[PDB]
């Protein structure tokens, strides 16, 4: 069976005091890390603070990593630097970085390449917009997005995929668990035919839309949804209930 | 004016190398009220660097978000930097303008957010080789400065940096006299737009190639108030560059 993966994307949020309060509630949850992956992604400057406060059962990572290695790149965090700090996970290709910060498919590839070279584990995001789905290009867009980086995967426990239904984010549309399931199933088929059957059966594919305490169970029960990249709900103490749904 | 010596480590460093580097830095005896010395480590190195460096050294980050707190994955807001007591930020470094689509409007929005949250900003600008050869040096720098200059209400808390892009990456080098000439032009731009008292107050740093050999000749120029140092700040000998402004 696939090991489930519950991720907390805190995005651009948090204070030192609020993290102290949030991590303490998180630590109260008793789970086996050898059977369930739980990863917290704080702001870069909050990493050390968050890592020290969280118990070892919780994995930690950063929300972005440079496509560049060490050198003259002001404001950048390389995979080499992340490895030296023992940062385990990275987020690559989150739609907010594609939206506001010019991040392209080729940037995603170079980031994954750098991350894997430096023995980091990567949470790679992709998905189609409202205009793309309405034109029935869901499969085409995702195929293009996945194949941009998929060949680089050398360990299928170490790369985790995230489907972001951008057509349901910031719009009027709402994504159902089964609408996500059918996309997840197609993503896994792409991995199957590009990498292999065993490799596709190994890889975790997470839902990256809106996840809360009420819908997490209906999402996790789907055959091809192996967990979530959680946004706003991961900033609340009730995030422990979202973890419990995958336990 | 109070001199200002900044260490821009860029995308460099390990936990071991930083400990070795902060060791040699801390052994230098200087008065924090007479000279500003600021170290800019990588964001994930900030806590480690701030702990190692004695308080005489100020600390900051190499970039700050144009957005506030919210759904902006990978970003560090000015609000978050304020909560961690991060004193300084770098805005508009040519490498972010070159590789990361950072514009004059982004610089403005970053500065507004920084000053709103009581952060002090190190704002970078400069002209290319093509622009200097086309006699557009003053035109380009005026445009770059005008993009943000109206936001400055405290002229101690905003520090300007001239980056001679025409002498960075090319086969050409800037003389101390050439650096001084541009610094004088920058101070005139502040004088023409804000006022004479404001221009005589603001720090303007040289952001070109600075080393232990050229620092004394650069710092003695009338309108150069310090440096934003790249490669040479990754060495223990950076203390000698600080010594030149003491």
SS (H, E, C) chain B: CCEEEEEECCECCCHHHHHHHHHHHHCCCCCCCCEEEEEECCHHHHHHHHHHCCCCCEEEECCCCCCCCECCCCCCCHHHHHHCCCCEEEECCHHHHHHCCCCHHHHHHHHHHHHHCCCEEEEEECCCHHHHHCCCHHHHHHHHHHCCHHHCCCCCCEEEEECCHHHCCCCCCCCHHHHHHHHHHHHHHHHHHCCHHHHCCCEEEECCCCCCCCHHHHHCCCCCCEEEECHHHHCCCHHHHHHHCC
Label residue B135 exposed, middle or buried (CB < 10 Å: 0-12, 13-18, 19+). exposed
Give kind and range of the element (H or E) at residue A160: strand A159-163
Nearest residue to B17 (alpha-carbon basis) of B6, B5, B9: B9
Cα separation, A232 vs A30, whole angstroms: 22
Q: Sign of the CA dihedral B110, B80, B95, B124?
A: positive
Write out the two tokens for B221: 């120029």
Q: B83–A43: do the CB atoms touch at under 8 Å?
A: no
Q: What residue of A is the nearest CA neighbor of B8?
A: A74
DSSP A15-35: -HHHHHHHHHHHHTS---TTT
A52 touching B, CB under 8 A? no
Q: Are B7 and A76 in contact (CB under 8 A)?
A: no
Write out the two tokens for A194: 């590009």
Q: A45–B48: do the CB atoms touch at under 8 Å?
A: no
Q: What residue of B is the nearest CA neighbor of A90?
A: B74
Known binder of ligand: residue A36? no
Please provide residue A47's backbone torsions phi and psi, each rounded to the nearest 5 degrees: -60, -55
Give the Cβ contact number of residue B167 at 10 Å: 19
Q: Sign of the CA dihedral B153, B159, B163, B164?
A: positive
Distance between A110 CA and the closest CA of chain B, angstroms: 14
Rounded to the nearest 10 degrees, what angle do helices B137-146 and B176-193 cross at? 50
CATH classification of the domain holding A104: 3.20.20.70
Q: Which of residues 225-244 of A touch B (CB under 8 A)?
A: 231-232
Distance between B196 CA and the closest CA of chain A, angstroms: 33
DSSP A185-207: HHHHHHHHHHT-HHHHHH-EEEE
Please provide residue A231's backbone torsions phi and psi, each rounded to the nearest 5 degrees: -95, -105
Cα separation, A73 vs A10, whole angstroms: 25
Q: A74–B80: do the CB atoms touch at under 8 Å?
A: no
Domain range for B25: 1-246
Nearest residue to B125 (alpha-carbon basis) of B141, B102, B149, B137: B141
Length, in residues, of chain A: 247
Q: Are A61 and A39 in contact (CB under 8 A)?
A: yes
Resolution (A): 2.0
Give the Cβ contact number of residue A55 at 10 Å: 12
**Domains identified in chain A, total number:** 1
Q: Are A126 and A162 in contact (CB under 8 A)?
A: yes
Cα angle value B181/B186/B189 (rounded, 5°): 130
Cα separation, A115 vs A78, whole angstroms: 8
Length, in residues, of chain B: 246
Please provide residue B73's backbone torsions phi and psi, each rounded to the nearest 5 degrees: -55, 130
Please provide residue A197's backbone torsions phi and psi, each rounded to the nearest 5 degrees: -70, -45
Q: What residue of B is the nearest CA neighbor of A125?
A: B73
Q: A74–B96: do the CB atoms touch at under 8 Å?
A: yes
Give the Cβ contact number of residue B173 at 10 Å: 13
Q: Is B93 a catalytic residue?
A: yes
Write out the two tokens for A237: 């103490």
Distance between B167 CA and the closest CA of chain A, angstroms: 15
For residue A58, the SS3 value is: coil
**Paired residues of B159 in beta bridges:** B122, B203
Write out the two tokens for B243: 């010594």
Write out the two tokens for A83: 């490895």
Give the Cβ contact number of residue B24 at 10 Å: 13
Please provide residue B52's backbone torsions phi and psi, each rounded to the nearest 5 degrees: -70, -45
CA distances from A11 to A62, A213, B225 (A): 10, 19, 38
Cα separation, B75 vs A63, whole angstroms: 8
Q: How many CA atoms lie within 13 A of A247 on its CB side?
A: 13
């Amino acid at each position: 069976a696939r090991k489930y993966f519950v991720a907390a994307n805190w995005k651009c949020n948090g204070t030192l005091e609020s993290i102290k309060s949030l991590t303490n509630s998180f630590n109260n949850l008793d789970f086996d890390p050898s059977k369930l992956d739980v990863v917290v992604f704080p702001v870069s400057v909050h990493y050390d603070h968050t890592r020290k406060l969280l118990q070892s059962k919780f994995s930690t990572g950063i929300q972005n990593v440079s496509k560049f290695g060490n050198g003259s790149y002001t404001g950048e965090v390389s995979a080499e630097i992340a490895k030296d700090l023992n940062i385990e996970y990275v987020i690559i290709g989150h739609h907010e970085r594609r939206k506001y910060f010019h991040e392209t498919d080729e940037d995603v590839r170079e980031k994954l390449q750098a991350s894997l070279k430096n023995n980091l584990k990567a949470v790679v995001c992709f998905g189609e917009s409202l205009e793309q789905r309405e034109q029935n290009k869901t499969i085409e867009v995702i195929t293009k997005q996945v194949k941009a980086f998929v060949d680089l995967i050398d360990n299928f426990d170490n790369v985790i995929l995230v489907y972001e239904p951008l057509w349901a984010i910031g719009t009027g549309k709402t994504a159902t668990p089964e609408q996500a399931q059918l996309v997840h199933k197609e993503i896994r088929k792409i991995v199957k035919d590009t990498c292999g059957e065993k490799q596709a059966n190994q890889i975790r594919i997470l839902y990256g839309g809106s996840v809360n305490t009420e819908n997490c169970s209906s999402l996790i029960q789907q055959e091809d949804i192996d967990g979530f990249l959680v946004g706003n709900a991961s900033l609340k103490e009730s995030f422990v209930d979202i973890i419990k749904s995958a336990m």
